[PDB]
A paper describes a structure:
Lipocalins are typically small proteins (about 200 amino acid residues) composed of an 8-stranded up-and-down antiparallel β-barrel and one α-helix. There is a hydrophobic cavity inside the β-barrel capable of binding a hydrophobic or amphiphilic ligand. Bos d 2 contains a central β-barrel composing of eight antiparallel β-strands (A-H). In addition, there is a short β-strand (I) as well as an α-helix.
Because the protein had been crystallised at an acidic pH (3.4–4.5), we decided to search for a new crystal form at a more neutral pH. The search for new crystal forms for bovine allergen Bos d 2 at neutral pH resulted in two new crystal forms. Trigonal crystals diffracted at 1.75 Å resolution. Again, the asymmetric unit contained one Bos d 2 molecule and a dimer can be formed with the use of a crystallographic symmetry operator. The interface area between monomers in the trigonal crystal is also 389 Å2 but there are many more hydrophobic contacts on the monomer-monomer interface. The side-chains of Thr62, Leu64 and Leu66 from the β-strand D form the core of the interface. In addition, the residues Phe82 and Tyr83 from the L5 loop, as well as Leu57 from the β-strand C, are located on the interface. Because there is a clearly higher number of hydrophobic residues on this interface, we assume that this interface is more favourable in solution than the dimer observed in monoclinic crystal form. Dimerization of Bos d 2 and Per a 4 resemble each other: both lipocalins form an extended β-sheet through β-strand D, although there are also some differences in the packing of these β-strands. When the protein concentration was increased to 90 μM, the relative intensity of the dimer increased accordingly. These results indicate that rBos d 2 is indeed a weak transient dimer in solution.
Residue numbers in the entry: 6 to 156
The structure:
Amino acid sequence: EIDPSKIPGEWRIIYAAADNKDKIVEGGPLRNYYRRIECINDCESLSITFYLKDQGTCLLLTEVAKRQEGYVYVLEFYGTNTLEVIHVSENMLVTYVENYDGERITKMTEGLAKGTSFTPEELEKYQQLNSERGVPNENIENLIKTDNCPP
């Protein structure tokens, strides 16, 4: 059960995982450094602020994802995406994204944090969510360690 009151916040991304790992490694289009999620009209839309890093340059973007059904949203960004908020707590948010780039479908997750770094229970929860959705835990990338764009 998703509590929409917990969705908004100054989130940072710790981990991402994808079946097509090339999408989320450094230089990949779906390696996105979160800064903020804002709910618009009671989460009818999510306004998501994040950085892309390209050739050493930090690109600060805000993209708006529109509600499709429940907490599944849609946005065009390097292809057609659905983005689902699959877990949210006071300190953790996990997304599940399906991206179609005209050639491949990519299934991926993002593990976002507030406060201190992911605990062991948070790490395990993230891996369990991945396994439930067929996203390989062997394809987990640590994003926070390469996030050197402005706070």
